[PDB]
Amino acid sequence: GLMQFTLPVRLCKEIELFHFDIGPFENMWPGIFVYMVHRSCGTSCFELEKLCRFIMSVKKNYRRVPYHNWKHAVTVAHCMYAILQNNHTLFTDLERKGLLIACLCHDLDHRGFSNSYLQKFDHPLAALYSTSTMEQHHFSQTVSILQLEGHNIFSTLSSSEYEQVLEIIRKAIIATDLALYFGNRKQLEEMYQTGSLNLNNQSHRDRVIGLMMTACDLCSVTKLWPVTKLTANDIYAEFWAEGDEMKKLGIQPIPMMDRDKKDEVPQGQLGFYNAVAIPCYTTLTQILPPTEPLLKACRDNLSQWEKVIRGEE
Ligand SMILES: Cn1ncc(C(=O)N2CCC2)c1C(=O)Nc1cccc(C(=O)Nc2ccccc2)c1
Ligand SMILES: [Mg+2]
């Protein structure tokens, strides 16, 4: 009850900023998360013993892949942490409980392959879940872990509050399917320009939570250049692996994924900041003004990639 987690001074201060890196010490990530839930939710919203056991089962069920790993899980939870803390009064008691858990669980049991590779492989998951393949699995693994003995962190909720929070979590994890991002942003753009956005409409909150989930998931592009640059190496390590596996199926992979087309990466990143990242943090800034530092940091990194192309690094 009276047991507050407390971080060293540099982390106590830098954890509140959007551009925070959780660092290379694996064994501090669980305490960082618990720290964030306590300040974001209350010391009271989870039984410590149950929370910890949930966190360590979640960790166990992420794999040793270059990017879609336990560090990605916690990095994405931190970004959500910063959005919630800078937007104190806009979010319900259940959203704050649901959304940090959603971020932690959002890529559970990822094997480092796109939904496309699963479909072309004819993986059993492609048959069970025809759209948003990995995302329906991720949710499936979240519900499995919650139903382990001593892992039910929502035990003090009523039957109907329990169903609301698992519904927040499901929509949140499904929204991390980038295929769904484009249409979701397009519609939020229109709702904001034609003045029809209304956060009391449940279907409007869903869209807005979806965009936060995209923004948190892409947050490697909102870091200082050295974090952005070195994270990109992990991202492309997965992408080239999937490229190799496409080639094993007798399929020339898209250039993004071909390790022979390493030269075209800087141009590929320009496309990605222009087509996806900048549009994403722009619209998010319009809906939630205090998330502007994500847009700013994203723009800075676009300009670092333009400098890569101009041979200036
Ligand atoms: C940096 N970062 N962080 C996350 C991801 C990411 O996609 N994922 C993490 C699992 C999926 C990336 C990332 O570099 N992607 C990337 C790289 C190269 C090209 C494109 C692209 O699609 N361009 C493009 C799209 C539409 C139209 C025109 C051009 C995208
Ligand atoms: Mg994912």
Ligand SMILES: [Zn+2]
């Ligand atoms: Zn992710």
